[PDB]
Amino acid sequence: SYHPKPWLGAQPATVVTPGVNVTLRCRAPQPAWRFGLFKPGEIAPLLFRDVSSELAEFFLEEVTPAQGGSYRCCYRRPDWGPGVWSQPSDVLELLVTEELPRPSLVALPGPVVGPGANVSLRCAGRLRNMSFVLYREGVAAPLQYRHSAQPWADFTLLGARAPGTYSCYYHTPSAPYVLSQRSEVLVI
């Protein structure tokens, strides 16, 4: 008998700084007795809750990198077989860090190249759903901002304004604010 997978979520976010209280919510599509959180390569659950509900909440206090990593949730009913769990939830990747890995900043190839032509820039990380910010040396305010689902943002510069030294970052779209290390400078 097939038992559809529960869903696993993180409050306030899946990317947080150390010391933040994280609530992990596991929602099954039907009520269950026991919910279990599992890390990779672990047969027994890391944490479990006996709730008689569709919802189980796992409170991860003042998080450290010990609380980070890949999580899967499973639910079970006592009438099922000895080691029978439901289908596992999709992985919830919890990232506990003070600063995000530095992105890369490149000039994208164009159909027509030369001085005074429009320049397309790519600020690329390895994390999805981030907000990218483009800066230019000598300009206090960011030039362009872009929120992306994909792990990159493209910024188009107009030819007449294109020359200069550029850097980029990315950060979390909501609280807590976690910022990446500055990208290596790019000279146009």
Contact residues for 129 (Cβ-Cβ < 8 A; gap 6+): 148, 149, 173
Q: Where are the alpha helices (DSSP H) in 41-150?
A: none
Helix (H, G, I), strand (E, B) or coil at 57: strand
> Which experiment gave this structure?
X-ray
Do 78 and 158 have their domain in common?
no
Do 114 and 182 have their domain in common?
yes
Do 60 and 104 have their domain in common?
no
CB 24, CB 10: distance < 8 Å: yes
Query: Which of 31, 65, 97 is where one domain is finished?
Result: 97
Domains in the chain, number: 2
Do 75 and 28 have their domain in common?
yes
Do 164 and 176 have their domain in common?
yes
Do 3 and 93 have their domain in common?
yes
Quick one: resolution in A? 2.0
Distance of CA 11 to the CA centre of its chain: 12
Do 34 and 88 have their domain in common?
yes
CA distance 60 to 40: 18
Do 83 and 151 have their domain in common?
no
Contact residues for 118 (Cβ-Cβ < 8 A; gap 6+): 110, 156, 157, 158, 159, 162
Helix (H, G, I), strand (E, B) or coil at 97: coil
CA distance 171 to 146: 11
Query: Which of 82, 97, 112 is where one domain is finished?
Result: 97
Do 83 and 115 have their domain in common?
no
CB 69, CB 63: distance < 8 Å: no
Query: Which of 56, 81, 97 is where one domain is finished?
Result: 97
Helix (H, G, I), strand (E, B) or coil at 44: coil
Q: What is the total residue count of the chain?
A: 188
Indicate which CATH number applies to the domain containing 75. Answer: 2.60.40.10
Two structure tokens written together for 141:
């305010």
Phi, psi (degrees; rounded to nearest 5) at 67:
-85, -10
Do 79 and 116 have their domain in common?
no
Do 172 and 185 have their domain in common?
yes
Nearest 5 degrees, angle CA 117-CA 164-CA 130?
90
* Domain interval for residue 79: 1-97
